[PDB]
Amino acid sequence: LTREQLYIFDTTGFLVIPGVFGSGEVESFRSELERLDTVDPGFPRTRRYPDLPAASPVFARLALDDRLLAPVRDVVNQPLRLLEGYGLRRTKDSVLYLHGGNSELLDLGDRQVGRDLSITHTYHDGKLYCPYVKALVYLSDIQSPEDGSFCYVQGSHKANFPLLRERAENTSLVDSGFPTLSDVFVRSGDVLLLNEALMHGTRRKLTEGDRLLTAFGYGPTFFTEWRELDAETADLRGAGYVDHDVEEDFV
Amino acid sequence: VPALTREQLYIFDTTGFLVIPGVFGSGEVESFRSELERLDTVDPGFPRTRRYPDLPAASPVFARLALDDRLLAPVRDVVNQPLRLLEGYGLRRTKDSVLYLHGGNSELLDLGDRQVGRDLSITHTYHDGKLYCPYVKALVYLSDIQSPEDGSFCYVQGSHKANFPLLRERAERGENTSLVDSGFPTLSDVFVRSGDVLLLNEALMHGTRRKLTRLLTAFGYGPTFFTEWRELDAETADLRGAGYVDHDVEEDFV
Amino acid sequence: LHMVPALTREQLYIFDTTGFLVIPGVFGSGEVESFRSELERLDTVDPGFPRTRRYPDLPAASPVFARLALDDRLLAPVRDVVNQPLRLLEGYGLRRTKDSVLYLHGGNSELLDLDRQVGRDLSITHTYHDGKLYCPYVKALVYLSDIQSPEDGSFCYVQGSHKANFPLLRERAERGENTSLVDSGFPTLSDVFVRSGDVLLLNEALMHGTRRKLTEGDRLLTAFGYGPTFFTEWRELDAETADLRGAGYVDHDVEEDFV
Amino acid sequence: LHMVPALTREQLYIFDTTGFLVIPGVFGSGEVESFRSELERLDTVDPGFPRTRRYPDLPAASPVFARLALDDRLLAPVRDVVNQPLRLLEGYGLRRTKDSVLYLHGGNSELLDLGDRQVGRDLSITHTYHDGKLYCPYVKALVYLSDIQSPEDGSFCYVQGSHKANFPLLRERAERGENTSLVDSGFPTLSDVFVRSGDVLLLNEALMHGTRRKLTEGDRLLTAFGYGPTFFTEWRELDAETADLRGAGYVDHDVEEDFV
Ligand SMILES: CN[C@H]1C[C@@H](N)[C@H](O)[C@@H](O[C@@H]2O[C@H](CO)[C@H](O)[C@@H]3O[C@]4(O[C@H]23)O[C@H]([C@@H](N)CO)[C@H](O)[C@H](O)[C@H]4O)[C@@H]1O
Ligand SMILES: CN[C@H]1C[C@@H](N)[C@H](O)[C@@H](O[C@@H]2O[C@H](CO)[C@H](O)[C@@H]3O[C@]4(O[C@H]23)O[C@H]([C@@H](N)CO)[C@H](O)[C@H](O)[C@H]4O)[C@@H]1O
Ligand SMILES: CN[C@H]1C[C@@H](N)[C@H](O)[C@@H](O[C@@H]2O[C@H](CO)[C@H](O)[C@@H]3O[C@]4(O[C@H]23)O[C@H]([C@@H](N)CO)[C@H](O)[C@H](O)[C@H]4O)[C@@H]1O
Ligand SMILES: CN[C@H]1C[C@@H](N)[C@H](O)[C@@H](O[C@@H]2O[C@H](CO)[C@H](O)[C@@H]3O[C@]4(O[C@H]23)O[C@H]([C@@H](N)CO)[C@H](O)[C@H](O)[C@H]4O)[C@@H]1O
Ligand SMILES: O=C(O)CCC(=O)C(=O)O
Ligand SMILES: O=C(O)CCC(=O)C(=O)O
């Protein structure tokens, strides 16, 4: 990544890199997804491809592809590991409410905490150290909010205050809007490099046709592969990720 | 009731560790020793030292100690995350043994195309009245350590919040001697009695003096998204390779 | 006796995350008209930028603006982002006409060459602790005219530049890019529109400026800078002096240095 | 033209991690003699601490100390820990005899009540690090002009790591009715520093520090020079912000003098 790209990833929490994969490559990726099973993730009008690398050698190798790994290296700067690799296929009336955010809250029963160390990032001696980054590979054009554009709360990756708990305001900000909520439009083939510290989601998709992407999650070698945990287990051997406040919790 | 007091949290924050005296009684200690003598050990690579690799696996006693509330309660107060047990091991040491310095907030690591100076496994922070340290140990001592010749725990003052690397420079000059042996202006010792726990932010640069006259068990905790402790040489070409890759330690140079 | 938070949780969130906050309609049209009429009575200086007039020290020149500088409607939000014993560091006015512009300045990690090069300016280095922001240098901009399009010379800022860890301007100069980003554009350069009577509360760590003004009519604002009591009142300083008694502010890279 | 770093890698490491640095033998015995002689010919004031005399403004009072304040043996290490365009903020002297003491002051996270709120950062001493450089806005060079080799000489003391403390220390002690200074009672992380005449102690004012009670005969003597950025005002004590917000000075957070 160039100095300007590093500046932009640092200051905004993400980076769009245009035309990483060519038209030939893109259609090849579309083909494989058509020939692959999906699940209901409990999100309306949304089909998920749960584990792309363990479902297809096309995506098992994309996960290790150099166009992805190299910019990821430049923002993680740790010995690297694959944490996850999934696909999303969306139709009209689907939506992805806000999640992420550097200072959102979590009640741990006896106490309330406001840092999630899995996304807590820093900077030292000319290098970014972000522990959890996604490479989003868009396989369809998203050029207006009604295409279900990616959206993000500006600067939320470095926020010191929690946003969502005070609102719980049962309407999502991706629908109602927010003064610092901005949209990002992408072309098929583009890659969005994302600091998972960013509070982000997508607008509601109102257009017809399929919205398609493949998401790959990376972190240091001492991170576990991604897995949802309701809470820490009684015998302290339960592994996984316990999310702080997200809009799904009250919208 | 908070596990750690105001003063205790202040001390852990400012020094990187906390000795809590008399956590486990005579009988408990004797029990722990008795169980240790039962169990197999491996050659950990350090002379006059035997390592009990996976105590919770090899013994129900230490499977139970690892979850003891007297360890978990203070550990919670400095991790403040959903918790996982990352490791649990024992160390038995005789005269002539030594543990060189390791840890350090800003020690270096060569990755292959770049040099990095943060280890996120030990990178800690503070937010709204709470410490957030990702990798902490509860060291449970099973023998008295009251002098440097007992092989006392020692640490580099403030090294858990260091912004500069210390060890690479020493090696570049060719200082083959360990600071635990030679001394260092800010290297200090800690003395404990058996049954005490030393609660340790792993970001701290620490080791032990050489023993001349030694029983402890160590339990490592972190967030639920950390993998259980395993030594890793480098990232695999597979990126499925899991483990912890340490930055500079004295063992690499001494 | 009946204190109410000057800033809401959401307002603090926005100021923290973006480095500024627009507070709408702080001053009603009557007060705005009063401020305008008072500026009409005052003289200006040439600040070295074309089509710009500066009212150099408004609290010294006017009881109206001396009062404004201390108005609780400005001080109360300022206290919520500085959170130190307070000092007024400057108070000035700007009147701009067509073809005037204000190049980018500020930024958290811009460079300064001293036998060494440094990348922090401690006058704008800010932090957060136990539920409170601590920003050492903040401005309250009171707009006395409507700025509703870029062509009105809108305030613009580089997104997240108040917490930037990398320098932006030194490299653009090295690459010979000698036109301002406010004219050329930049991917994360964004505009802010305001109405007369609005206040823009600004962390001076933010890299900001304005677009070039193309429209008719006077663009008018008054700006008040605040910091801790141990900060000196604002004065430009070229370099530390030989005797180490020189006081003032030595800015890091700004676009004016090479555009 | 032939610049070598004022501070070594190790010296920077130590200053960063401990909040201070003792630089031995910076000034020779003859120079120390020159400084002592000059102080004897200058007037003091009563600073309001028992058995303590203060020379309030040495660089104004005498060209010798004006020159000392600008000596590169002080300025070069100061520059390496401030890393800003520099200004001299104060220069004073302290002469102490037996039964004198200096209670703890400083500390990164001590509290200050401001009427409608309590704050826990003092931006005059809030310091950071970036790209290989320390940025500490308020540092002192203490030039010792006598030997201090035991606690009863009134040794400098400090709370370990207090320059980077995230919690306050003094307020809770006061609330728990502990009105005995830690320099008298001790504290688990309170440490002492011994110095020789001619040594310089370079000090991050974020560090919580003071001295032990002096019991010994012979004057305890030093001169202190305070430096920070050009936009800092010269040091002046200030109780509160002023009515017109034009008042300049430094409003300290909790110090032991408030409680003990
Ligand atoms: C009832 N299950 C929900 C329980 C919530 N506590 C989770 O935060 C939520 O999960 C989140 O959902 C939001 C939408 O509301 C996004 O889908 C987030 O994106 C996810 O899940 C995130 O983020 C994860 C991690 N970034 C955070 O653990 C992984 O990357 C996953 O692949 C990814 O779908 C689950 O859906
Ligand atoms: C040849 N193998 C060595 C490879 C080095 N790169 C390691 O850093 C070193 O490992 C370290 O050894 C030092 C002694 O020189 C301490 O023993 C450290 O303490 C250890 O290993 C640490 O720290 C680990 C983690 N804290 C860091 O990975 C785990 O807790 C281990 O169980 C624990 O013994 C290994 O021995
Ligand atoms: C030769 N004169 C220029 C010398 C540069 N080194 C200054 O940075 C520049 O000063 C800056 O100019 C830009 C425009 O190019 C803005 O005007 C900045 O805004 C200023 O000057 C700032 O910022 C100052 C402080 N924020 C920074 O010291 C004060 O607020 C001033 O009132 C305010 O005009 C001067 O004009
Ligand atoms: C009733 N007057 C006291 C009021 C307190 N609020 C001050 O904190 C205290 O001032 C402090 O006193 C302690 C002793 O209790 C040390 O002397 C500190 O050191 C001082 O005063 C500091 O620190 C100042 C700055 N470091 C902080 O403002 C300057 O360096 C001074 O020259 C220096 O004496 C005054 O004495
Ligand atoms: O669909 C997008 O553009 C973003 C997807 C996302 O944020 C996620 O899957 O976590
Ligand atoms: O032996 C001790 O006292 C501490 C042991 C230790 O530091 C370790 O094994 O990591």
Ligand SMILES: O=C(O)CCC(=O)C(=O)O
């Ligand atoms: O004119 C504006 O809108 C902002 C002016 C500004 O940034 C300044 O005066 O420094």
Ligand SMILES: O=C(O)CCC(=O)C(=O)O
């Ligand atoms: O007397 C000393 O050794 C230190 C004095 C000091 O800390 C001060 O003057 O603020």
Ligand code: NI
């Ligand atoms: Ni997401």
Ligand code: NI
């Ligand atoms: Ni260890």
Ligand code: NI
């Ligand atoms: Ni400006």
Ligand code: NI
């Ligand atoms: Ni002092």
